[model samples]
Target: MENSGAYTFETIAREWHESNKRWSEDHRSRVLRYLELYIFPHIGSSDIRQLKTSHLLAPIKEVDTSGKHDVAQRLQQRVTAIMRYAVQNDYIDSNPASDMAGALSTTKARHYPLEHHHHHH
Candidate 1:
């Protein structure tokens, strides 16, 4: 769990991801896919110790600004989870997301039919 010159955030993150025993294959794939599509491109290369509140917000801000409030919330949740794992593993001293719980949007979206708002399903 060390974030030395030898250990990067991606590696440590993967360690945490692999350590999860309760996730099913589908769940794991989806979760890891989110990490890959969002978090990885942004701050995944940096060391865990190099992480900052702004760093964590990089992907969060991206998703939020794109009108995907729901996705932003989910990414925030997942990042917080990893940050907690980092703290539990002694990789970090504190969890930034733990304190910034309301940083992401929590609004629920609604879509209505243009015709009569009838069910299409």
Candidate 2:
């Protein structure tokens, strides 16, 4: 694949693999799979520096639409971690993924017991 100025998806993937070597093999495989399955097909060829929030977020939305909310959430976090690593290595100016928490939908809310439960024997 073509390198985008200074950084590319390959570079980020390499960094992720190198830094997270101790991570479970399954976890690492899942991260890579998510990238290949969802991300690479979309913006994998683009320059990392040129990637915007919308570009990264589109894949997550697609996953959610496909009924993979859990995968989407995990992928979102993995993507954010990759971007943060890019920033640390001076591959990008800043992490667009840094402020993406608000962009994600909360699938579950805090659970509270109903008052009716108190009446149960």
Candidate 3:
């Protein structure tokens, strides 16, 4: 292809989703489904290189405000990964979505397991 600059977010994302390894069939479908449902309809047609964090965040926040923190995080994660892939592939100079860390809210709490010296046999 002559113009890599014409690549849309959706195009890059689909390539990344298909080529990415280690995903089970169920997880793969969920990834594609979420992108299609929450992401593609919004900024999918935008040029990948032209997207900013705010552009990507707009749609994800829609899910966030609905109180689905986990789904929002997952959507953001996939966006970050897709942009990272674009960076690695030289489609973009850097990842715009990489700056999104800590921008999303979460509902899960961190748990530290206790280490016991005594063994229960």
lDDT of 1 by residue, 1-121 (tens): 4754646554655565565544564665566665666755666676666566745676557666777767666556556666766787776786655554463435545476364443221
Q: Score residue 59 of candidate 2 by CA lDDT.
A: 57
lDDT of 3 by residue, 69-113 (tens): 677766676667777667878867866766775644454564764
lDDT (C-alpha, whole model) for all candidates: 0.60, 0.63, 0.65
lDDT for 1 in candidate 2 is: 45
In candidate 3, what residue range of length 10 has the lowest lDDT sum?
112-121
Per-model clash counts, in order, read: 0, 0, 0
TM-score of decoy 3: 0.57
Candidate 1's displacement at residue 98, Å, is 4.1
**How does candidate 2 score on lDDT?**
0.63
Q: Which ten residues in a row have the lowest lDDT in candidate 2?
A: 112-121
The reply for model 1, stretches above 4 Å from the true place, is 1-24, 30-34, 101-121
Tell me the lDDT of model 2 at 20.
Answer: 46
Error of 3 at 19 (Å): 6.9
Please list the residue runs of candidate 2 whose C-alpha ends up more than 4 Å from where it truly belongs after superposition.
1-7, 19-22, 26-34, 101-121
lDDT of candidate 2 over 71-117, digit per residue (tens): 76666666676777678777678667666655455555648846333
Q: Rank the candidates by lDDT, best first.
A: 3, 2, 1
Deviation from truth (RMSD, Å), model 3 = 9.2
